[PDB]
Amino acid sequence: VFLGFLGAAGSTMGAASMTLTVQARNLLSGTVWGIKQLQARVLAVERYLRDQQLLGIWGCSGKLICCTNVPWNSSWSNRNLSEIWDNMTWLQWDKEISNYTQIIYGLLEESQNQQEKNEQDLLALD
Amino acid sequence: VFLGFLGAAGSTMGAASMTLTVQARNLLSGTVWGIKQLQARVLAVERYLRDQQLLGIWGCSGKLICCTNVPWNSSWSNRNLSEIWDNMTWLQWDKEISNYTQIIYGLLEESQNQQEKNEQDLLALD
Amino acid sequence: VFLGFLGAAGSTMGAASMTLTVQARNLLSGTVWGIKQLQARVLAVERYLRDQQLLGIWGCSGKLICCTNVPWNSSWSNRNLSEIWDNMTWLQWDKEISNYTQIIYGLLEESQNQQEKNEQDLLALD
Amino acid sequence: QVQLVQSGAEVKKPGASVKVSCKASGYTFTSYYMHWVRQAPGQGLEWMGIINPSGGSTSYAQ
Amino acid sequence: ENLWVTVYYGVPVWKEAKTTLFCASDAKAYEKEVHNVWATHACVPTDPNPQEMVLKNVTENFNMWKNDMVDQMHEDVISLWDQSLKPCVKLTPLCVTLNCTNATASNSSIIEGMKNCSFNITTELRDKREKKNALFYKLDIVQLDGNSSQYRLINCNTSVITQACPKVSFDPIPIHYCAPAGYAILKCNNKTFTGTGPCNNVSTVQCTHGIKPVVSTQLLLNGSLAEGEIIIRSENITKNVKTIIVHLNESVKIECTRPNNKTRTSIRIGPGQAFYATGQVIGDIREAYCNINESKWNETLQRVSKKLKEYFPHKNITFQPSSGGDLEITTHSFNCGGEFFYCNTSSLFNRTYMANNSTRTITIHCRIKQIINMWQEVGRAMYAPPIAGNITCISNITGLLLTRDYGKNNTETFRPGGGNMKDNWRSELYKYKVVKIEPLGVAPTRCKRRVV
Amino acid sequence: TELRDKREKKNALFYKLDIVQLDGNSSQYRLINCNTSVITQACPKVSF
Amino acid sequence: IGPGQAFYATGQVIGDIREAYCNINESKWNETLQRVSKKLKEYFPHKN
């Protein structure tokens, strides 16, 4: 089934994660005015790679869903989410936490670098 | 040794897998008519990324050889392959199973999504 | 903090590895003369992918720092490095070992292929 | 560098006609509307009309 | 409790954005090897499939006055018209003093300036010239500022006039638009949508339907119809607005014709160049005209008035005819048959309304012109060869472009407007918005990562 | 100018370093570079 | 010249005649060159 993009979209997070592979894959599908066709294609590629590299920097290069060790806290958004996780959903969530993405990403980088150092020391002691 | 592409090619699968790193790497090596040089280079890049992303979707982003948990069955091609694995070889194999690639890929996606869910539940219960 | 590139640069290796994520990420940031803007952007992308693929060939696709099993030897550069590791530093190091990069890379490929074969046999025997 | 330039005029006899004009630059001429207004010493302001230089048509106060 | 950061990739979240959209076309090629059409539209991937996905519980805001795609339609239309004259002969050698006496004219519509207009042309060898003559329509011929017996082409002392190649004659080709990867186009499925505010029925497509590059003033023709009743779209900040767009839910058929029959002639210029002009005219004389059904015209305007008063909910409504300006803004302009028509529509908007089919044909009179200063540019005039024989043309009327003016009393006054080509395209692109997708984001979860 | 059919006698001032004597009668003059190359003018808008 | 073309040239000249010229301060010109000479002789460390 080709759901294109933004198929769900109106759904709960539950539930919405079921199509992460759809949006991940439909993202790579692409007289002097033709110069713009090439420019648009170059932009699509560069943007893809920047996000893929960032997942690698955070230690999540191989996954659509990735669990890490930066703790969640209340200096950020403030929701218990016992019901709201499955009732909000995504657009509203990003707006609610829109003032923290530049903060969280910084924590993710620090956490991954610490883990890499710990791995190197443990292997060195082998 | 630069074997270029399709060096073996006439060999058994045995045997043929010995050069997977050759074909994997030689694949990235690339007045108004010059617009076509850029178009050709863009196409080579986009095609590479689409295949690399797909291996990631199936859980095999880091490997040339990858083992998964979709069972083989007889609704697909029908060969015992005790000898034929090492006597066929690749061109003939793809022709024999040419009617199933659009089926197998669907199974690979389902298998990987199930494993990712299982990992998240196991970590959540930690 | 945006350190751009080559921030340290004059430092010991110690110490210098602390910014590997900086140089890794600042590397992807990009009338007929405009044809050159597209050509330059295509070159930046192709060069990035070639290095990323090579780390994958050696088994280090997900890491900035990667430990492998090719032994170090004296047929290459000759330094004890007990102090020099943290006193040389990088430009001088590459010059000292400039005659061996075409050798070491060959060893890295062989080591990774052997490990992949060993994994397949161990899984097959499961 | 947006500028408007106007010429002067004489005193006319009752029943006579007068022509006045305005030149303008620093912005594309055909990209905007122009207005004319009138005020006499000791009086308030009145709107007279609008002209669209792009085409064009006009509209005037009754 | 014990929440940790988790990261997801492939989240269905989007933002408004400015981008570049690309054309898409129909399955059938132009097939004339024309750079501005065959290589511009016929070599464009064809038949995109609009497999619309309807989204449950999605609300989005659609602003049709301000968006980022109407301007692209405008630029694409201009680009084609400039390229279409690229390989075609310039008429510079024709800008010579003309001697047109109209001695043989048989009608008042002719004798003003058309018959046997003569000139001295050097051709084909540079060494020799001959006296030639041809017929030109009167609206394009002006008196030389000298003796009244001397004439000049209307635009040749200020700009370049070029002719068109038969192969580049351009009729409408519907153009479909598609987003580049990472972008999506949203439609607003609301039959009563007026161009502003939220829509509670949102769906997405990989392509829009085709929109034809049709240019007109006063009346909107060949377009789609409103699903329900007549919808009048306007701005809601101040009442001093430039354009009122009336979209009908029923078409009115208009039939037009140019009843005479013309002979085409050709004056050689040089090695692959010739000037086309009118030769002998057949055979009696009738003026060009258009036919409108009376009951449909009157019913349609009564229904428009009923809805128009919603924006002006007070006194009555009066319509008026064109007040002034050049012909494109005062007449109904169209290009049936490849020739340009300027019809007098002043008889059609003289109705008044107040608070509390194939019969009685309404006819209007039309004129034609050959040298056109197109809406797209200045300084580069396009000429047009005559089309031999007569011209017949049938099209559908889907809407009106109205403006407002001062009445003589306390009622509202409306009249036909136009010239803003963007208001034609904006009348079909009102349904689309383009957004970008940003798939990466974070959320809390009851999960920690193993160190080992 | 402007109609190809008619011509007029015009005159203007040019600076002396750009005017050369025609290789003939001394009363006749030529633009300094026009017998060997193309001379173009500049648009006011491109003054740089 | 034609339909969007014209040649620009000089018309009446006003109104008396003076040659074009440039003004330089004397002490700065002389001091500057003396300092240049002082450094130039480093490359040519011999005669004047």
CSV table of C-alpha atoms in Angstrom, one decimal, chain C residues 18-102:
chain,number,residue,atom,x,y,z
C,18,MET,CA,37.3,15.8,21.7
C,19,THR,CA,36.1,17.6,18.6
C,20,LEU,CA,35.7,14.7,16.1
C,21,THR,CA,31.9,15.5,16.0
C,22,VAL,CA,32.6,19.0,15.0
C,23,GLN,CA,34.5,18.3,11.9
C,24,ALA,CA,32.3,15.4,11.0
C,25,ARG,CA,29.2,17.6,10.9
C,26,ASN,CA,30.5,20.8,9.4
C,27,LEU,CA,31.5,18.8,6.4
C,28,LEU,CA,28.0,18.4,4.9
C,29,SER,CA,27.1,22.1,4.7
C,30,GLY,CA,27.2,22.3,0.9
C,31,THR,CA,23.7,33.7,-15.2
C,32,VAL,CA,25.3,30.4,-16.3
C,33,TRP,CA,28.3,30.4,-13.9
C,34,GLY,CA,25.9,29.0,-11.3
C,35,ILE,CA,26.6,25.6,-12.8
C,36,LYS,CA,29.7,25.6,-10.6
C,37,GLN,CA,27.7,25.9,-7.5
C,38,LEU,CA,26.0,22.7,-8.3
C,39,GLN,CA,29.2,21.0,-9.3
C,40,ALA,CA,30.8,21.9,-6.1
C,41,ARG,CA,27.9,20.6,-4.1
C,42,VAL,CA,27.9,17.3,-6.0
C,43,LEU,CA,31.6,16.9,-5.3
C,44,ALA,CA,31.1,17.5,-1.6
C,45,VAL,CA,28.4,14.8,-1.5
C,46,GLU,CA,30.3,12.2,-3.5
C,47,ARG,CA,33.5,12.6,-1.3
C,48,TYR,CA,31.5,12.2,1.9
C,49,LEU,CA,29.8,9.0,0.7
C,50,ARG,CA,33.1,7.4,-0.4
C,51,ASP,CA,34.6,7.8,3.0
C,52,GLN,CA,31.4,6.6,4.7
C,53,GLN,CA,31.2,3.6,2.5
C,54,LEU,CA,34.9,2.7,3.3
C,55,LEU,CA,34.2,2.8,7.0
C,56,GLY,CA,31.4,0.4,6.3
C,57,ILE,CA,33.7,-1.9,4.4
C,58,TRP,CA,36.1,-2.0,7.3
C,59,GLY,CA,33.2,-2.6,9.8
C,60,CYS,CA,33.2,0.9,11.4
C,61,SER,CA,30.1,2.5,9.7
C,62,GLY,CA,28.6,3.7,13.0
C,63,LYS,CA,31.6,5.2,14.7
C,64,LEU,CA,34.0,8.1,14.8
C,65,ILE,CA,36.3,6.0,16.9
C,66,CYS,CA,36.6,2.4,15.9
C,67,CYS,CA,38.8,-0.4,17.3
C,68,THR,CA,39.7,-3.4,15.1
C,69,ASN,CA,41.9,-6.5,15.0
C,70,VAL,CA,44.7,-5.7,12.6
C,71,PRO,CA,47.9,-5.8,14.7
C,72,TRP,CA,50.3,-2.8,14.6
C,73,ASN,CA,53.8,-3.6,13.5
C,74,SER,CA,57.3,-2.2,12.9
C,75,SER,CA,57.3,-2.5,9.1
C,76,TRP,CA,55.2,0.6,9.2
C,77,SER,CA,56.1,3.7,11.1
C,78,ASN,CA,58.4,3.3,14.1
C,79,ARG,CA,57.5,5.2,17.3
C,80,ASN,CA,56.9,3.8,20.8
C,81,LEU,CA,54.4,6.7,21.3
C,82,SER,CA,54.3,6.5,25.1
C,83,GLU,CA,54.8,10.2,25.2
C,84,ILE,CA,54.6,11.0,21.4
C,85,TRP,CA,50.9,10.0,21.1
C,86,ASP,CA,50.2,13.0,23.2
C,87,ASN,CA,53.0,15.1,21.7
C,88,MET,CA,53.5,15.1,17.9
C,89,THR,CA,50.6,15.5,16.7
C,90,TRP,CA,48.4,14.8,13.6
C,91,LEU,CA,50.0,16.5,10.7
C,92,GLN,CA,53.3,15.2,11.6
C,93,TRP,CA,51.9,11.8,12.2
C,94,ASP,CA,50.4,11.5,8.8
C,95,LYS,CA,53.7,12.6,7.2
C,96,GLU,CA,55.6,10.0,9.3
C,97,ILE,CA,53.2,7.2,8.2
C,98,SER,CA,52.4,8.6,4.7
C,99,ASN,CA,53.9,5.6,3.0
C,100,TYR,CA,51.7,3.1,4.6
C,101,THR,CA,48.1,4.1,4.2
C,102,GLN,CA,47.7,2.1,1.0
